[model samples]
Structure formats: structure tokens, C-alpha cells
Target chain A: MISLIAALAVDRVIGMENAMPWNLPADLAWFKRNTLDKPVIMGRHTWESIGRPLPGRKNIILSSQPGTDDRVTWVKSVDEAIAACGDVPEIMVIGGGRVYEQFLPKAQKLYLTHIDAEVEGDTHFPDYEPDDWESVFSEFHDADAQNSHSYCFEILERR
Target chain B: MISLIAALAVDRVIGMENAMPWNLPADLAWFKRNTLDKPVIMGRHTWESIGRPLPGRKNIILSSQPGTDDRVTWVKSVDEAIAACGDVPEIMVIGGGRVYEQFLPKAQKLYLTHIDAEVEGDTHFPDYEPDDWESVFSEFHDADAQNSHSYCFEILERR
Candidate 1:
């Protein structure tokens, strides 16, 4: 199944300019688990945020720039991402706002991590309908009590 | 807004074998009207299903094939589609199946033509949460009357 998700905030924000400020450890673990050994597709900006290549999975970075990294496979378009993700049952699309917007229409499931607290950011996730998808699973994590932020992990299935 | 729609059947089947079948006129009109000035992103299969280029709007097809067509512009991945569609008010994701599955997560609106009749196929639209989108408008036509196809034109907005 193709999965779509928003690593976003209350303002539907995805980044402060081009990068996320907060770190959701639980969400990170969840992200790691879900994308392990799978094909992870993303844009160059997201890859820059990550710094190094993520292990165990094929990293595909969609960029027109003339640069290459061994750990990351640079492709030019969405069609190339599919080709890069060939044969994998699941392809994880990790991203920045622009990248997410482009791939959002093709995902079957969404692993959304909703931050409990709102933050100031420049990038945002695109809006969507509520009736089309069925909530297959959801988990809400309270703010560590120290951090005012809470997180809602959700998995949506299209009906 | 980003739009993702699946042309499916039964438990939500879209297309199979020779790609999508059953051409719906109103659906095509709806697609054009909605995506007319916006960017239309899709896969090779989705592109090949129609086997031609779409006129008016920007037809960005994602595929491994290094082919050129006058009807559509070609991109290698989802990122390229977004970059190519820069500054546009909306991005419309047209699909065969996998393209739909991979890109549905980022759509702010969904315009679906629910065909009353189902065709034989294998590709299916991916699942999502009902909370992801909200239906804002719809129009239904009788298949018996309107050119042998009964279908509902639906427009959904993301929350």
C-alpha cells in the first residue's frame, strides 16, 4: 500500500522556511519503523535536512541539480521516483511542503503526526477532504508534560 | 490545492491490464474545468491510458520512458511536477493507479467522478481518513440518460 502522511503542525505547517525546528522522537521512531527497508522518496531539500543518507532503505532524491551521492539516488521527477521504487510493496514519501504537495495525491495511507502545539512556520501541508478516507488507526501522545506539544499519530485509509 | 482521484470499482478498483477503461465525458469535462489552468501530474500508465496528450493545461507525466510529447510535459518524479507547476493556484493529479496512490496525501481538494457502473480492472485508489477531506459540491447524472453513463461529479475540500 502506498502511504501518505503529514509531518505537520497545527497551522498545517511543515517547515520554518525549509526545515523543521522541533524533534518528535516517538514520531521519528515511528518513521524509522515504517520506512525501514522500503523505498523512501523525497526532494533535495528534505535530503539536505537529513544530511546523510538513511540506512537500510533506498533513498531517492528528486532534483534537477547536477550532483550525486552514493547513499541517495537523485531522480528528476515523480515518474522516476516510481522507477526508483520499483518492486517495493511500500514506498515512503518523506518531505518538505513542496515535495509533499506533489506526491500527496497518490498515497493510499497517511501517517500523520499532528503536533499538539502550534508553531510559526513558512511551509504548510495542502488541505484535504474528511469523508473520503477511513481512519484505520490513531494514537495520540501527550506532551511529555514538559513540552507543551502533544502528538496525534494517525493512519488513514481511503474508502 | 493538490487533487488526487482514483478511477476504481467494487472495493475501490481503478484500472488494470491495459490501463483505465470506460471513458466518462462529464468526468473529463470536470477534470478539465478543475485542472484546466492547474498542473496535471500523472504516471506513464495514466499517460498511456489516454495514449495522448491533454491540451490547455500543463500535462506533466511522470515516467521512466525518456519520451517527448507535444500534449504533455514530462517529469521524472513527483518533485519535478511540483517545481514545474510553480506558482500555480492548484495542482491536479490525474492517475492510472500507483500515481494516484503515491500522490493523494497532499491534495487540498478532491474532485471525483463516481461512476455508477464499474468496469473490469485491477488498479485501486488508496485509502485515506474521512477527516482528510470534506465534500463541498456534487452533481449526479443518470447513466441511462447522459450518454450511457450514470455518474456523480464530486468536489471535496480539505480541512
Candidate 2:
């Protein structure tokens, strides 16, 4: 299953200065738990933003430049990333704007954390028609001292 | 108080051919119920599309044309409609694109029905920051023989 996941603000922004704008430990933990042991494909920018291959997941980066490290696999295109997944039933598309836009058309499911903030950013989530997706579940979360903003986690599947 | 209300599809479209694209009777009834007894404002084109003033409420039209009817109150601007509202606590700004865009900046609330269809239309709702508004209520409805599409009724207040 091809899946796409990201945390976007009110403006559908996913990144600021090559990093996530908000610091939400719960969201990060949730991301880690969900993508754990799965083939997580990302763009070079996203890999660079996080600064290494994520632990407990097969990291595949879509890039022209080859990976210098043995832990990560660098592919020339999105199709190469999917091919690199081998017999894995599912692959998670972690992002930067370009990667999300490229895979959005083929994604079977979307895991999105919608933030209440309208923080400015250069990159935005690709626009998609709601008719193509159905919201199967949603859970609202409130902010505390550790979390910077309140957000809702929603799971949508291609209808 | 001014409130903007419309039934928009995933693409943010509100109208097609100067009229609502869908034939959802429940949505129309919902509109009538909310705008009932309160001053309902619309642009000249919206007035023309409906053909006449809505009953059980004060219908105000924002137009540059000379009055063609004695029943409907026509004004040149939005401010005139507010001034004409008298002591009423709230006035509903009904639509046809331009009217919604004009009142959005100062609108205290929004009553939006989010339609599931990816409808093609000539008129669209203005893009607004979600941070500027807070979603207070949402109710989901399913589609059937009477309702053309499934939708969610959402009420948002300016933050």
C-alpha cells in the first residue's frame, strides 16, 4: 500500500526553512510508531532536514546523488523508491513539497495532522479533491506545555 | 454582526451559471432556517438568479442599478446594508462569489456546508486563513435520493 503522511498548518504548509515549523513531540512519536519497520520513502531535502536515516525503518531517499552511507538507499526517481521496497506490502511517503506532490496521485491513504496555526512557509501541500478521498477517522488533540499547537490527526483513504 | 454562508465543493466553488450547482433541498432548507427573520444580503447577480426576494425575512440587494421592485431593498454598498439592518444582532451575507469576498474581511462568523463532490463552477469562495477563524460546530450528513451529495455543516467564528 502506498501511503502519504505529513503535518500541515491551516495554509497547508508542510515546511519552513527546510524544517517543520512546530515542535510536537506527540506527533513525532506518532509518526515514528506508525512508520516503524515500514519502507519510508522521502526526498533528499526531507532526509537532510532530519539529518540521517530514521531508526527502525528502511529509509529510501529519492535523489540524483547517491547515498554515501550504507544505512540509506538513494534512488533516482519515485518509481525506483517503490521498486526498492521489494515485497513489502506498504511504503510510507515522508515528505518535502516535491515528494508529496509527486506521489499524491497514487497514494492509497493519507495520514495528516491538521494544525490550527497559519504559519508561513515556502512549501505547501499539493491540492487534492475531497471527492477522491474519504475521511475514515479523526482524533483531535489539545496543546500542552510541550506541544506548541493544537491539532487533529485524520486518516483519509482514496474512495 | 455579519456572517458569510455558502455550500462549497472541495475546489471552493460556490456557484455555476449564477446559481447553486447542486439541488440539495436539505441544504436550502438549512439556509432558509438560519436566514429566517434576519436580514439576508446578496449581490445583484444573486438576486437576479433567485428572481425575487426570499420570504419571511428582509432581503437586501447590493446593486448600482435603480430599484426595479418595491419589495426588495437595494443598496449601492455593503455598508449601506449594515446601516439599513437597524438594531438586528446578525445579518446573513448570502452569495454569488463577489458578495462573499466583499464581506469576508469583516464577517464575524461563517456558515459553510462542505460538499463532497468536485463540482465545476464559475464562482468560488474567497480563500481565507483558517487561523483567523475557529470551528465551533460541525455536523455530517449523507447523500440520498433527495440530497445530491454528502456534506458537513460547519459553523466558524472569527478568532
Candidate 3:
């Protein structure tokens, strides 16, 4: 199964100035816990934004101009990235907008953090029909001293 | 005080083909319950989409090409619409995108229904900074046999 994980604002905004618009340590922790030890695929911009390979995860980056880093494997296409994952039961696509659009159709599950705020952004997650997915898990978190915005985490499976 | 009332999808989509993308009778009931005796302001397009004036409420339509309908009052600008409302304590700006953009800056309160779904639409609610508004009331409603999508109702006051 291919799963897409992302945290987006109410307007589907995912990126602003090449990085997440909001800070939520709790959501980062959730992302790390779910994707640990998994083969994570991302686009060139997403890889560049992270700056380094995530520990305990295989980083497969799709880029036209492959880099000379031994820490991560660079592929030319989505097909190549999936093939690079080998026999993993589930592949995680952790993205920058473009990568999500490419993998969305092939993804069987979605782990989404719906930030209850609208914000200005340069990049946005692709629009999709909600009727195509069924909510499997959902939890809402309120803003606190640590997290600045109220948000909801929801897991959805293709119907 | 001016209040903006709208229902938008997760992606901020408000209209598809000049109508709501989803059906939710419960939300309509909620809208009517709150705005029944209040003056409701809307743009010409929004008024045209509804085709008829909402009963028991004053319908103030802002339009460049004023209409001669006795049932609804057509004004040339937002200021005219507000002035026409006279002594009303709170005016509701019901919308179709552009109207929301114009009134957003002047709005003191927001009655928003956050629909938990991504949808394609030509019209969308204006992007807003959530930090500027404080959530005062919130309630979540699951998708039942009537409502095809899960949604949340929230009332926010400008900070």
C-alpha cells in the first residue's frame, strides 16, 4: 500500500517559501512515529527543504538532476522511486505539493493533519473528492503553549 | 457589527458551478435558525444563485446593475448595503467569494462551517489568518444518511 502523509491548512496550503507555514511539534512527532523504518519518497524540492536524510528511514528522492549524496538514493521518476522501495509492504510519500499530486492517484491511504486555519502559501495539496475516501481514524487537538494552532489528524482509506 | 457567514470545504471551496458542491440539510437549518430575523447581505451573483429572497429577513443585494425587484433591495456598493440595513445591530454578509473578500476586513465575527472534504470549485472563501480570529464555539457533526460529508461548525470573534 502507498500512503501519503501531509499537514495542510484549511485552504489546502502545504508550503510557503519552501517550508511548512506553521509549527507543530506534536504533528512532527506523529509523522516520525508513523513513518519510522519506512521507505519515504519525496520530490527534489521536498528533499532540499529537509536538508538531510531522515534517520532510520530510506530516503528516495525523485529529481531530474541527481545529486552525489550517498546518504540518499536519487531517482528520475515516480516508478523508479517505487521500485527502489523493494519489498516493503507499505511505501510512504512525504511530499512537497508536486510529489503529492503524482502519488495521490496511486495512494491507498492518507494520513492528514487538517490545520484549522487559512493561510497564504505558494504551494497547495492537490484537490480531491472526499467521497472517494472513508475516514478510518480521527482526532482533534486544541492550540496550547506548544502548538500554536488547533488541528485535526485523520486517517483515510480509499473507498 | 458586521458578521460573515459561510460554509466552505477543506480547500476553502465555496461554490462549484455556482452552487454548493455538497448537500447538508442540517447546515441549512442552522443558517436559517441564526439569520431568520437578521438582515442578510450578498453580492449580485449570490443573490441570482438563490433566485429568490429569503423570507423573514431583509435581503440586501450589492450590484453594479441594480435590479427593480420589490422583494429584494439592490444597492451599488457595500457601503450602501450597510447604510440600507439602518439600525440593525449585526448584519450577516452571506456570500459568493468576491463579497466575502470585500467584507472580510470589516467583519467583527465569523460564523463558519468547515466541511471536511477537498472539492473542486471556481469560487472560494477568501484566505484568512486564523490567528486573527479566536474560536468561541465549535461542534463537529459526523456524516449521517443525510449529510454526505462530515463537517464542523465554528463561531469566531476577531481579535
lDDT per residue as tens, model 2, A86-122: 9988899999889999999889999998987665677
Best by TM-score: 3
- For lDDT, candidate 2 versus 3, the one ahead is 3
Per prediction, the TM-score for chain B is 0.85, 0.94, 0.94
> Arrange candidates by TM-score, highest first: which order?
3, 2, 1
- Per-residue lDDT tens digits for candidate 1, residues A44-89, read 8778767689988898888888556876788998888789788878
Residues B3-75 of candidate 3 have per-residue lDDT tens digits of: 9999888788886334443456678888998899999998876776566889999999987886868898888
- Weakest 10 consecutive residues of candidate 1 chain B by summed lDDT: B16-25
Candidate 3 lDDT over A28-137, as tens digits, reads 88999989999999988777767689999999998899686889999999899999999999999998889999999999999999987676777898897899999999
Where does candidate 2 chain A have its weakest 10-residue lDDT segment? Answer: A16-25
DockQ of each: 0.01, 0.01, 0.01
lDDT of 1 at A149: 47
Tens digits of per-residue lDDT, candidate 2, B20-122, equal 4344667878998899999998887677667677999898888788788989898998889888788888999988688888999989999999988675566
Specify the CAPRI tier of model 2: incorrect
CAPRI quality level assigned to candidate 1 from its DockQ score? incorrect
What are the chain A TM-scores for all the models, listed individually? 0.91, 0.95, 0.96
- Report the Cα lDDT for candidate 1: 0.70
